[model samples]
Target: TKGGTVKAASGFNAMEDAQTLRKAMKGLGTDEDAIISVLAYRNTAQRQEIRTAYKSTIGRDLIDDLKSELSGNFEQVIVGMMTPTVLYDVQELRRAMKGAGTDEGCLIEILASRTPEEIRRISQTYQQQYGRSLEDDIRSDTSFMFQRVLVSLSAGGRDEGNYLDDALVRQDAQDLYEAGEKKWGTDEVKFLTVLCSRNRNHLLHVFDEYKRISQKDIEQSIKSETSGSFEDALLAIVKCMRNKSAYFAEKLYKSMKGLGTDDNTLIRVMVSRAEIDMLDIRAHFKRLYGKSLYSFIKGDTSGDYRKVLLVLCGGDD
Candidate 1:
């Protein structure tokens, strides 16, 4: 129900901006600040338009030039900002599932949080470009009911409507309690069916009713009942169902809170959410962490990467 923090730049000249960016990348000393200046303000469509202009006029891929010119975390932020959001998401999913070990955090964050329509769009784009169903790739890299949770979400079958059904998840809450804390062994399928299928509003009530029955937070029960990636995926769905903005705030906070940052999570959340719900994420960050997200990034990151993220941040608060 919220809008993006970032807005399209007015009086934009895509070709001119493209030429400016090309020049910034070409000089003996690349002007990384100029790159940030041009890109960090443009919204998604404007960014894509600039990329098209860059290619058509310069005959080189903008991403290629930027990659060559920029390095490390700065490069990632800039490259991600430059890429179209959905394509970036599809590619990120592909990256997570590829190679020997899976980045399960990445997998759960995306599939668990994306809308059914967004998931369908991502799945379609994944297949169209990679010739592999996103679900199939996920199944290949994963196992068990954990895998089942992801596959279920991958099908884009979640109830996205706003309607509430107390009766359904009343049974759902009981079934869940009986399946887990009420019984010796957990019925993960019951958890999966209810968590994956119910609308967010319905799931919210289900969790309340579940706590009423089990006398424990559903998340606590998840912690005691499940383990590892399976547990992570389930928790993600539950947290996101409750509050997506707060869920992302917690993620952004975790990525920056202690020691070194998880740049992948930081960059992905910033880039993906900037034009969608970053403002909301920022608001929730202040509430949960008692500090502004802008301050966190400023203190946690340095140089050009810090600069662009602040731009995407859209505010001090």
Candidate 2:
């Protein structure tokens, strides 16, 4: 629903694109320019089609060929391009939960940004591909309230209606206040139910009413009420409710700042948002960071990785 930089390419020819990619990989030295020209310009759907044609006509897996030919971040972007978006999301989730500790930020961002249907689909796909329940993975990897919040989110059954009930809104605001700052102990379920279940427009109204009742921002309330990953998750939900693009812009900037880059975060945000609001995120990045994402990427990364990132970034803001 959000605007993206990678729209369907005009005058698209999947077979031609496939052949061009084939030519790029045929030689000893890869034509990095040719690969980027084809893969970066086409949207995910078109690129997927090319992958299909490449497999059928060329008798080879396009992704495999690209993987064999390219290395580093360039390979990442190209392979990411070849992947179906849903599958890529699941892979990211799997990667996040696969290692020693969890990448809670990645989980929060991906889970918070998705719709109920999208969440449901990703959960199903996660189970199918990884052969483990997403809930079980979260429960195993995280502890206490963080696990509880993620398990609730994994249900993916948020109320999606546009109709706003004024009475319910006020009640939720009051309930949120009573559950958090007004009480000795926080009822996290109260926070989760209201935050996760309500539609965005309805929650927007609820947050406004909450500001009036608490005399504080909802984010501030969450900060006071919770700690660790739970606090981060709740704050992510609140920020996502207010402005998802800005939320992503903040995430992207944080990934690059304060020492070495979180390449996983950089790649995930860039690849996922490439076809959905990367442009808006770019505008936000410029406003928030005082430099373009393109420049930031160029400065932080080198060689083919930088080229692929810049290409996916579309252009300097």
Candidate 3:
């Protein structure tokens, strides 16, 4: 339904690119431009090939060399690019939950947007990588219905079919309405069960059904019924259901808005979505905010960080 900006380079040779990267980083003065050029265009599979070839031929880890050569946000983007996509997600989740204060926004976005299969891999790799269950960390960091939602998501068994029965769709919407708007207190488990487990297409229908019944947007109901991270996580699921590009476009805007940048979020979305649906995101960014994501990034950031971000942006819409 959507398009990606980063196509795997045609006739890609991993070893040759690996050599160029080695040469670029070898000199006392690193060619940051060259590094950005090579790395930004290559998709994840190609990048991993380069990483493998670098170790086999050059006798050093590509991530290590790249880390040593670059610094700051530039290094962060480069290192993120080199990691495999799923592993990159696992790391991002780990980074968010590792520190003292949990980045609930990070937790919600990653878990909410990912497919059940993707979530499954993340959960599996999370255990393997950290030797701690993701659900365990989630329980430690969060509580109440929000914690229940995250735990439901960790099982990664959401229905993947498009069996969108009209009756069931209406029932689901009624369920949500009764669970929240028509109830004394919100039945969060019902919200979790329906929103977290329903397939995307079914959820799209349910959103409309919800509006028809409740005379309010699903998000409006969530906001009115709940507060804080609980509300945030529920809204993330609804937005991801409605239109993921717009969801990400909003993220990119919020990341660059106000006094300073949220570079961690900016880089995470840019790198993670570049090969998935950034073109859609770019189009939505301009549509939603009436300014190109390109110009926004240009106005917000500078140096190699901006340069690499522009490359991933593909071009000004």
Predictions: Cα RMSD each: 1.6, 2.0, 1.7
Query: What TM-score would every model get versus the actual structure?
Result: 0.95, 0.93, 0.95
Off by over 4 Å in 3: 181-184
Winning candidate number (lDDT): 3
lDDT against true structure, model 2: 0.85
Which candidate order results from sorting by TM-score in descending order?
1, 3, 2
- Taking all chains together, the TM-score of candidate 1 against the true structure is 0.95
Predicted candidate 1 versus true structure: per-residue lDDT over 122-151, tens digit per residue = 999999998988888888999999899999
Model 2 scores a TM of 0.93
lDDT of each: 0.89, 0.85, 0.89
Q: Which ranges in model 1 have alpha carbons more than 4 Å from their true place?
A: none
> RMSD in angstroms, candidate 1?
1.6
Question: Per-residue alpha-carbon lDDT of model 3 for 46-133, expressed as tens digits?
Answer: 9999988999998889899888888999899889988999999999999999879899899999988888789889999999988999
List, in order, the clash count of every candidate structure: 0, 0, 0
